[PDB]
Design an enzyme around this catalytic site. Structure first.
Site, PDB file in Angstrom:
ATOM      1  N   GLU A 159       0.864  -1.204   0.000  1.00 38.01           N
ATOM      2  CA  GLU A 159       0.000   0.000   0.000  1.00 38.01           C
ATOM      3  C   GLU A 159       0.890   1.240   0.000  1.00 38.01           C
ATOM      4  OE1 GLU A 159      -2.134  -0.933   3.544  1.00 38.01           O
ATOM      5  OE2 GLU A 159      -3.476  -2.349   2.467  1.00 38.01           O
TER       6      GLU A 159
ATOM      7  N   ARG B 103      -1.612  -1.010  15.936  1.00 36.58           N
ATOM      8  CA  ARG B 103      -2.304   0.101  15.213  1.00 36.58           C
ATOM      9  C   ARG B 103      -3.010   0.925  16.271  1.00 36.58           C
ATOM     10  NH1 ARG B 103      -4.300  -2.987   9.776  1.00 36.58           N
ATOM     11  NH2 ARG B 103      -2.254  -3.830   9.131  1.00 36.58           N
TER      12      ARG B 103
END
Lengths: 519, 519
Positions: free
Chosen positions: A374, A454
Site C-alpha cells: 500500500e 495500530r
C-alpha cells in the site's frame, strides 16, 4: 486516599450517547469506601452550551491476575458491537450520576460501596449533535472525595480533547463492518469518503464487500446517507460473497471536478484471501480485476464500472490493485493512482498508474521498490512525485521519487528513517502555498505512529518536502487501538480532514486546523 | 465426468428453513458446463409427507490455495450469526431450484454456467415444523446430469439422516450465545434443559451470564419460552458483567420431583476468566460462589438462590464449582452433584457433592483424581457411583468408582482407555433394566468421539456397566464442528434425549430409540 486519572486522547463523537472523558482507578480501596463526590472543571474558553450531558459510571473491579496499572477492566463504549456502538454497554458500566446543564465546575456523586483493592469509575461526556467539529474541551478532575476526605489525585490528565463524527459504525445499514477509508474534496468544497462495506464480517476479500461513499456539503458536520459507488452482486451467477469489490482509492480530476473510484473486484476464489489466492492471467475467473466508476455530479451518482485490467495488468502478475486511499491531479493535469502488484514469484511492489487524457486510458511503468504494498503519492514539487510505501521489512515507511511517472525511481533521504510504522496503510498529501493559510508548501502525513500494532493515529506536517517531520508539527488524534487505515484531504485553506479507522468508529471523520499542526 | 457427493451426518432441524442434506463437489468442470438435473431417491418407508421442500443451491468455486478435497467453500447455514441462524446465507448460496411436492424420486435443475475447475452445489431439506423427532431420511443422489450426459457419482453418501430441534439459536432473546447444557426428565415426563445465557459474546465467566431453562411437556417437539432460573443482575452495585452465573448442573429429586439447579456465581474479577482469577477465601468478593435454586412446580418457577459455598468449600481452594450437566438421585434417595475444585497450588480435581436430606445440607469428601475437571456420575449398581472425568492428560476419560460417596475411590477397568476424548465435557447416565424396553441395565455416554477438536458427537451404550463400549452400540449424531458439551436424559422407556452444543444450533435436542443403539 490515592486516585489515578486518565484523560484518553481519543475522539469525542458528536453522534455518540457516551464518550470516555475520564477513566479513574482507585487502586487500594477498603471494602465499604464511598466516592462521595468528584469535581470536574472545563477551561474558561470551552463552549459548554454544546455539552448535552456528563455522567459518572461505576465499572466494578479488576481481575487478580491483570495487575494494578490499567484504567478499565473492559472497553466501555464498543466500536464493534452491531447492537450498540453509541452508548456504554450497561452490563459493564452502572450510571451513578448525571448533570444535563454544564457549568465550568461540575460535581458528580455516588453512594456505591467499593470492594477491597481496585475500583474503576469513569466520566462520560455527551455532545449536542450540532457541536462544531472544531470545538475542544480542556477538562480536569480537580477533587475526588472518599469517606468525606479529599483524596490525592495523580495521573497525566491535561489532554486537550477533540470532536469527531462516526460517519460509519459497525452494524449501520445492516453491514457487519466498514474498512479501508479514502477521502477527497471536490472543486465545490464537498467531502467524499469511500470505504469497503463488509456485510458478513470484517475479513478481507474474498467476501461480500461493496464500495460505499459518504458525501458532506458542510465540512463534515453532516453526511448524506451511504451510496454504493461499486458492486458486482451475483455477476455470472456466482454468489455475492464470491464477487467482492474493495480497497477503494478515490481522486478528484481537479480540471473537470469529475470524481474517480478504482477498486479490486475478486470473482470466485471461495471464501479465502485474494492476497494469496489471486493467480496469474487476465479474466475475472483467473485474477482480480481493476475496475473504475466516475461521478460527473460531485459524487451524487456513479457510472457503471469499466474494467481497466487489460490496459495495465501484466498477465504474469498474480494480483494488480490500487493503493487504497486516494489519488491526485498533478499541476499539469495528470491523474495519478498509486498501485501495487504481486509478481510471478509472489513478491509485492508499489508503483503508480497515471492518465494524461482525463481518465480515458491508464499506464503503469516500473515498480518503485521490492516487497512494498500500500502506498500514497503526492506531487511534492512541480513534475516530482513522492511515493510513500508500506514496507514488509517493518519499522518505517519506504519513500521514493519519480520525475518520469515511474519509468525511473530515486530513493528519498527520508526512506526507511523519518516515518515509523507497524506495516500499515498511511496517507500522504501535498498542499500548495497559495492553497493554505500558512502560505507555505506542506506535506501532511497520517498513520499509526508506532512500530507495533495500530494505535496513536497522528497527523504529521513537513515544511521541507518531507525531508524533516518535526515532533512540534504533529497532532495525536487516537491513542487507543483500531484497524489503523486513514486518508487526509484539505477541507479549506485553514483545516485538514482525516477519514480513518479509529478506536471509536469504523469510519471516523475529524477536522484539524493547520495552525494547530504548525504554531 | 466425475462428481463427489457428501451426505453429512448432522441433524436436520425441524425449526430451520435450510438444512444441508447433500454437498456436491464437481472438481474438473470446463467453463460453461451446466448441471442440467440431479435426481435424489428416498427409501420406500420414508415419511416424505413431513418434507416441506427440497432446494438446490450453487455456492460457486474454491480458492486456488485450498485444494480439491473440500465439499464447500464456507459454512452454508450459520449456527453463530445472530441475524440469521435458520436459512442459508444468501451471499454464499444462490437458489437454482425448489420442489415442494417431495416424492420417492425428485429431480432438481439448474441453468448455471460452471467456472473452470471446482464448482460447489448443495441440496437443502426443509421439514414440516411438526415433524417427529424420531423420523429418519435415507436419501442418495442417484443421477447427476452435466451437458445432457450422466456423470460418474463417487462419495460415501449412505448416512441415515436424523431430525433435531434448535431449542436455542445464537441471538435468541437478544443473547449472543448459549452454552453448557444440562438435561433431566421430571417424574411427570417433562424435559428440563439448562444452559448459560451468554449475553455479550461466547466467553466463559467472568461475563454477563445467566442460567436459562427450556421446558418441554411433549418429549421435545415444543419448548416453552426461555425462563431465567438464576441471575445476579447488579448485586452489590457491581455491573451485571461482573456478576455472571454459569456452568449449570440440574438434577431431579426422584422421590419428590423437586428439581435442583447448581451454578457458579462470579462477583468482580474484571473481564477475565474465573478459571485463572478465582482466588482462595469464602466471600463473593474473594472467590466463586456455589449457588442453588429449586422448582417444586416441575420447572415452571424457580426459588431465590441459596449460597451453599460455606457448607462445602475448603477456604484454601482457589475455585469450587459443580460439574456442568446433571446430577442424580440414587436408589436410596441420596441427591448427588459432580463437583470440581482448584486446590491452593492451582491443580484441579473432580469429585462428588451429595445430600441425604432432600437438598437441605451438602457434603464433599475426597477428590477422585488429580488434574481432572468436568465430570458426570451414575449409580452403575446399588450404592456404587461411577465418576467419568475430563482428564487434562488428554486422549481419554478417567473412570473411578466410590462405594462410600467419595471418602474413597478405585480406578475402573475402563479408566484412560475405553472412551476417547479431546479434553471436553461428557455425559454419563444409568438406566435400570425395569425402566427401559431392552429390559437390561444400560450405561449411556455422550461426547465428541475424537482425541482432537470437538466433532463426531456420539451416543455410546454399554450392557456391562461401562466395562465395554462395543462399536456396534453407538450412534453418530454430529460429524461437524461445535463446542462439544452434551447432556443425556431418558425421555421414556424407549428413547434417550440428548441436549448438546452442535454444528447446527447452540442448544440442540435430539431423541434416539434405545433399539437403534442396541440391535
Amino acid at each position: 486516599d490515592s486516585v489515578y486519572v486518565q484523560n484518553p486522547q481519543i475522539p469525542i463523537l458528536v453522534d455518540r450517547t457516551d464518550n470516555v472523558l475520564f477513566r479513574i482507578r482507585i487502586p487500594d480501596a477498603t471494602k465499604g469506601d464511598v466516592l462521595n463526590r468528584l469535581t470536574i472543571r472545563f477551561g474558561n474558553e470551552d463552549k459548554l452550551s454544546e455539552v448535552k450531558a456528563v455522567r459518572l459510571f461505576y465499572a466494578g473491579t479488576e481481575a487478580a491476575t491483570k495487575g494494578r496499572s490499567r484504567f478499565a477492566p473492559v472497553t466501555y463504549v464498543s466500536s464493534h458491537n452491531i447492537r450498540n456502538t453509541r452508548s456504554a454497554n450497561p452490563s459493564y458500566s452502572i450510571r451513578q450520576d448525571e448533570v444535563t446543564t454544564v457549568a465550568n465546575t461540575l460535581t458528580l456523586k455516588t453512594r456505591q460501596p467499593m470492594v477491597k483493592g481496585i475500583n474503576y469509575f469513569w466520566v462520560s461526556v455527551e455532545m449536542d449533535r450540532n457541536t462544531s467539529l472544531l470545538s475542544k474541551l480542556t477538562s480536569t478532575v480537580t477533587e475526588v472525595v472518599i469517606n468525606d476526605k479529599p483524596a490525592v489525585i495523580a495521573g497525566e490528565q491535561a489532554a486537550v480533547r477533540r470532536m469527531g463524527i462516526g460517519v460509519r459504525h459497525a452494524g449501520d445499514d445492516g453491514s457487519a463492518s466498514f474498512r479501508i477509508p479514502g477521502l477527497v474534496t471536490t472543486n465545490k468544497g464537498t467531502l467524499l469518503g469511500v470505504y469497503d462495506v463488509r456485510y458478513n464480517n470484517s475479513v478481507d476479500l474474498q467476501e461480500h464487500i461493496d464500495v460505499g461513499l459518504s458525501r458532506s456539503t458542510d465540512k463534515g458536520q453532516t453526511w448524506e446517507p451511504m451510496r454504493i459507488a461499486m458492486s458486482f452482486g451475483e455477476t455470472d451467477g456466482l454468489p455475492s460473497g464470491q464477487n467482492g469489490v474493495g480497497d477503494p482509492s478515490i481522486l478528484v480530476d481537479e480540471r473537470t471536478n469529475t470524481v474517480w473510484v478504482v477498486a479490486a473486484w475478486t470473482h470466485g476464489m471461495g471464501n479465502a484471501r485474494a492476497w494469496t489466492n489471486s493467480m496469474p492471467g487476465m479474466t475475472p475467473d483467473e485474477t482480480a480485476q481493476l475496475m473504475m466508476v466516475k461521478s460527473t455530479d460531485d459524487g451524487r451518482t456513479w457510472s457503471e464500472s469499466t474494467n481497466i485490467t487489460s490496459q495495465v495488468k501484466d498477465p504474469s502478475w498474480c494480483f494488480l490493485l490500487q493503493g487504497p486511499g486516494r489519488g491526485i491531479t498533478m499541476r499539469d493535469g495528470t491523474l495519478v493512482f498509486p498501485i501495487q502488484f504481486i509478481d510471478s514469484l509472489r513478491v509485492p511492489h508499489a508503483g503508480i498508474m497515471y492518465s494524461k487524457d482525463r481518465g480515458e486510458t491508464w499506464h503503469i511503468h516500473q515498480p518503485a521498490r521490492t516487497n512494498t504494498t500500500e502506498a500514497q503519492v503526492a506531487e511534492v514539487e512541480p513534475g516530482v512525485l513522492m511515493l510513500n510505501m508500506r514496507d514488509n521489512r517493518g519499522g518505517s515507511r519506504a519513500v521514493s521519487i519519480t520525475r518520469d511517472l515511474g519509468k525511473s525511481w530515486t530513493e528519498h533521504s527520508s526512506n526507511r528513517s523519518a516515518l515509523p510504522e507497524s506495516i500499515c496503510m498511511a496517507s500522504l498529501i501535498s498542499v500548495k502555498a497559495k492553497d493554505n493559510i500558512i502560505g507555505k508548501d506542506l506535506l501532511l502525513f497520517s498513520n499509526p505512529n508506532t512500530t507495533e500494532g495500530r494505535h496513536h493515529i497522528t497527523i504529521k506536517a513537513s515544511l521541507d518536502g518531507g525531508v524533516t517531520w518535526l515532533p512540534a508539527h504533529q497532532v495525536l488524534l487516537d491513542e487507543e487501538d483500531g484497524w489503523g487505515y486513514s486518508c487526509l484531504s484539505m477541507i479549506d485553506r485553514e483545516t485538514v480532514g482525516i477519514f480513518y479507522e479509529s478506536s471509536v468508529a469504523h469510519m471516523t471523520f475529524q477536522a484539524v486546523k493547520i495552525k494547530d499542526l504548525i504554531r
